Design an enzyme around this catalytic site. Structure first.
Site, PDB file in Angstrom:
ATOM      1  N   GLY A   1     -10.709  -4.391   8.769  1.00 45.14           N
ATOM      2  CA  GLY A   1     -11.240  -3.076   8.445  1.00 45.14           C
ATOM      3  C   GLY A   1     -11.585  -2.979   6.981  1.00 45.14           C
ATOM      4  O   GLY A   1     -10.823  -3.446   6.129  1.00 45.14           O
TER       5      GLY A   1
ATOM      6  N   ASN B   1      -6.742  -4.280   6.973  1.00 44.84           N
ATOM      7  CA  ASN B   1      -7.422  -2.979   6.819  1.00 44.84           C
ATOM      8  C   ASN B   1      -7.347  -2.500   5.392  1.00 44.84           C
ATOM      9  O   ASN B   1      -6.228  -2.343   4.879  1.00 44.84           O
ATOM     10  CB  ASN B   1      -6.748  -1.936   7.716  1.00 44.84           C
ATOM     11  N   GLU B   2      -8.507  -2.234   4.788  1.00 43.47           N
ATOM     12  CA  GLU B   2      -8.650  -1.791   3.373  1.00 43.47           C
ATOM     13  C   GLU B   2      -7.588  -2.452   2.562  1.00 43.47           C
ATOM     14  O   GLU B   2      -6.651  -1.811   2.076  1.00 43.47           O
ATOM     15  CB  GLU B   2      -8.615  -0.254   3.227  1.00 43.47           C
ATOM     16  N   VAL B   3      -7.681  -3.777   2.495  1.00 43.82           N
ATOM     17  CA  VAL B   3      -6.677  -4.559   1.831  1.00 43.82           C
ATOM     18  C   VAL B   3      -6.881  -4.502   0.299  1.00 43.82           C
ATOM     19  O   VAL B   3      -8.016  -4.518  -0.185  1.00 43.82           O
ATOM     20  CB  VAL B   3      -6.734  -5.990   2.314  1.00 43.82           C
TER      21      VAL B   3
ATOM     22  N   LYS C   1       0.851  -1.208   0.000  1.00 42.24           N
ATOM     23  CA  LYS C   1       0.000   0.000   0.000  1.00 42.24           C
ATOM     24  C   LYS C   1       0.874   1.241   0.000  1.00 42.24           C
ATOM     25  O   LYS C   1       0.623   2.135  -0.762  1.00 42.24           O
ATOM     26  CB  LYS C   1      -0.955   0.008   1.185  1.00 42.24           C
TER      27      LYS C   1
END
Length: 770
Positions: A416, A387-389, A350
């Site tokens: 998430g 989280n927001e993968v 990310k």
């Protein structure tokens, strides 16, 4: 055996000292001498491009650096096994003992141990550590660099319990009793039997149960009568003591904190703790603590957690990685539930140099070490596997959920940004803020459990106000940047009351009116309207370093600023999350130039009603029915005061006076005594005051600090997200009236004096007994 503190007196070399720096013979006599925990990044200079780091990593230096340390082995330890515990090293550390390579470990948030025993020598032993943050874009936030958590030498009998080798589990049966099991790993080389003894010491120091078991893993079963249950309101923590004995002689001992509580999660009524239902009033935070960066002393962690606790908060989510041992230990004793999250993205990076690059190869060792470190903490109620993968795969999701299910069958797993599946609990992020979304999930998936893992996102800067609503996408867009999908926030006035603020476009309003999709109040009202939604973790507790475009050193995400000063949003949450009667007024009452003009005066409260007064003339009483109370008030200088009423009695007040030109400072300290050589922290908050001692909300005076006696500076800060300055020098400008200085004791006892000075201000002094 014994645990040796190994923090004092390392050698440090900023930059890459080359291959030779691992060996015994290397000459490190030109190196800096320091103590760890240490974040070398928070010691450098902001640069927009030159440091390598960017808007996410926070514009401070990274790269490679080295640590080295010498130690000697006493005679008592000739028999012993000797290991080194690193609670954390950001990141890619390699370690060497007397020249011999122990391993390389990419993950920067995980605790890890290495065995030194086979490589130890007669006199002088060498540790070398290379920390490689040359690929600097390792996070979507400021990470820090270095040996940022403590280091210990674990010195044991060859027969001992390995690090992370005890698993405690309990089951409550009504409130008369509970049962529990103990899984204890034992390393040993001798076949003779071992008598394992274990003690549950109650919070009051008395021993509440014993269990004993012969071993030749060793698994014990026990129970306890009327155990004291763990909750936020009553953080009862037992201390499990486990000994390996033989012929009634203790060979090894290991202590850990544990607690008793029952967790229930269901899709209809949400979360229940100890059979009593409980809304999760949560916040996210990151691991860094402002002016100290990633190397946080326990006292400061304590100070921050307690501020959260007083806001009425009962849970924190470790966005987005494991925190320190000290953090979970304090949530246990202070009564804060944790959602313990182990990852941001998975195998697609990310931020370009983040754990993404190491996942496929390291996910299993890392997450195992994580779960085994933390699974005993009663504070932990829930895991997050990310989280927001990006590039998520069923295969990866299953791999993770099974690992967590296997190593800890007693807590649920979320992730998430997984609102529409191997999860136990769906985690809503930002889309949970849009119109109709929560409702449409509930209609369509009434049997799934749900929690808001990141709701809401609101932006605010301390001491700044705008009477008209701002929306991020139009007014302060994120670097990657609809009307019909937000929950409206009407303007407070038709024409703007603080047009002079248009000159600070990098600051957002501290009314409840600078957001992305929804107000703070509306979010919480919605979360409460839905019994099926366990609760919410707002984005942004403390402002945190990084994740902000130049010229910002930090974002406006938190309801408390980067120096631990509450913004008005803090008191908005306090007013919704606590019962003790309170009232809070905004903005201040220092508006020179605006005589006659409308200032919107807004009240937050948990009382039945509030009456507002300008110089003790009533502007009228308003009942409190759940909305913020607004009075539109023509400005005259004087004393503005809101009176909070319950059952016809006035039970709380808040007020402001119009300030004159700055004249001196007011000093306020959290402590006035400190033990010499300890790692305690003195936090002094400074207000610029006028000649009658009224604080000046617009003061930005440059201050100077002078310490005498046995006191040391740790750092300074003002909370201004666009002011970049050296954190370890005794100068600082105030921001909207305030600044903060952090002091520690030196090696020797004595009387300590801080003096604060500024041009055209009267100095003030503050004494700290050591």
């Amino acid at each position: 055996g014994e645990t040796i503190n190994f923090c004092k007196g390392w050698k440090f070399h900023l930059g890459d000292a080359g291959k030779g720096a691992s060996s015994s013979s290397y000459n490190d006599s030109q190196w800096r001498i320091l103590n760890i925990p240490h974040d070398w990044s928070i010691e450098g200079t902001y640069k927009q491009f030159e440091n390598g780091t960017d808007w996410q990593s926070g514009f401070l230096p990274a790269g490679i650096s080295w640590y080295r340390k010498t130690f000697t082995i006493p005679s008592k330890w000739k028999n012993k096994k000797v290991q080194i515990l690193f609670e954390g090293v950001y990141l890619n550390s390699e370690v060497w003992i007397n020249g011999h390579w122990l391993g390389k470990r990419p993950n920067g948030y995980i605790s890890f141990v290495y065995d030194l025993t086979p490589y130890l020598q007669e006199g002088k032993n060498q540790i070398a550590v290379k920390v490689d943050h040359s690929k600097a874009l390792t996070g979507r936030w400021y990470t820090g660099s270095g040996i940022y958590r403590p280091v210990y030498l674990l010195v044991s009998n060859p027969t001992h319990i390995p690090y992370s080798g005890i698993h405690f589990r309990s089951k409550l049966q009504n409130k008369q009793s509970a049962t529990y099991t103990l899984s204890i790993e034992i390393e040993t080389q001798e076949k003779k039997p071992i008598k394992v003894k274990t003690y549950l010491q109650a919070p009051n120091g008395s021993i509440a149960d014993t269990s004993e078991k012969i071993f030749v893993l060793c698994f014990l079963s026990g129970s306890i009568r009327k155990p004291l249950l763990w909750s936020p309101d009553s953080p009862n923590v037992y201390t499990l003591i486990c000994q390996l004995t033989r012929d009634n002689k203790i060979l090894d001992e290991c202590r850990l904190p544990v607690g008793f509580r029952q967790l229930e999660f269901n899709p209809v009524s949400g979360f229940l703790l100890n059979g009593k239902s409980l809304k999760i009033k949560g916040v996210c935070d990151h691991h860094t603590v402002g002016a100290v960066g990633a190397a946080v002393p326990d006292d400061l962690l304590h100070y921050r957690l307690k501020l959260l606790k007083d806001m009425g908060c009962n849970a924190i989510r470790t966005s987005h990685n494991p925190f320190s041992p000290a953090f979970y230990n304090l949530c246990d004793t202070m009564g804060i539930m944790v959602l313990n999250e182990g990852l941001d993205g998975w195998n697609q990076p990310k931020a370009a140099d983040d754990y993404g690059n190491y996942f496929d190869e390291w996910w299993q060792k890392d997450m195992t070490d994580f779960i085994k470190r933390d699974r005993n903490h009663p504070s932990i109620i829930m895991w997050s596997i990310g989280n927001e993968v990006t590039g998520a795969t069923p295969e990866i999701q299953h791999n993770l959920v099974s690992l967590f299910h296997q190593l800890d069958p007693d807590r649920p797993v979320t992730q998430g940004g997984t609102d529409p599946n191997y999860l136990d609990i769906i985690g809503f992020n930002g889309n949970g803020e849009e119109i109709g979304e929560l409702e449409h999930f509930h209609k369509n998936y009434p049997t799934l459990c749900a929690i808001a893992t990141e709701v809401p996102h609101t932006y605010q800067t301390r001491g700044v106000y705008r009477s008209q609503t701002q929306w991020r996408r139009r007014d302060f867009p994120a670097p990657w940047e609809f009307k019909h999908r937000v929950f409206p926030i009407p303007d407070l006035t038709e024409k703007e009351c603080f047009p002079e603020e248009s000159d600070y476009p990098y600051y957002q309003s501290s009314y409840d009116n600078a957001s992305v999709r929804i107000s703070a109040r509306k979010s919480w009202q919605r979360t409460c309207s839905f019994p099926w939604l366990m609760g919410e973790f707002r984005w942004g507790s403390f402002d945190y370093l990084g994740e902000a475009e130049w010229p910002q050193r930090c974002g406006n995400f938190g309801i408390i600023d980067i120096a631990a000063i509450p913004k008005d949003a803090y008191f908005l949450y306090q007013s919704l999350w606590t019962d003790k009667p309170m009232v809070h007024l905004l903005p201040h009452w220092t508006h020179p130039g605006k005589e006659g003009k409308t200032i919107p005066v807004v009240i937050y409260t948990n009382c039945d009603a509030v009456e507002l007064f300008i110089n003790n003339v009533s502007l009228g009483s308003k009942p409190y029915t759940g909305e913020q109370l607004i009075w539109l008030v023509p400005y005259s200088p004087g004393k503005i005061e809101a009176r909070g009423i319950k059952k016809g009695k006035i039970v709380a007040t808040d007020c402001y006076q119009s300030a004159e030109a700055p004249h001196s400072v007011a000093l306020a300290s959290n402590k006035y005594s400190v033990k010499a050589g300890s790692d305690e922290v003195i936090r002094i908050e400074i207000d610029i005051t006028d000649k009658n001692g009224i604080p000046c909300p617009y003061a930005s005076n440059e201050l100077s600090f002078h310490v005498s006696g046995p006191l040391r500076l740790l750092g300074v800060d003002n909370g201004n997200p666009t002011d970049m300055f050296p954190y370890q020098q005794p100068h600082c400008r105030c921001f909207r009236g305030k600044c903060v200085v952090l002091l520690q004791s030196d090696e020797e006892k004595g009387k300590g004096t801080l003096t604060v000075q500024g041009t055209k201000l009267v100095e003030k002094k503050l004494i700290i007994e050591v």
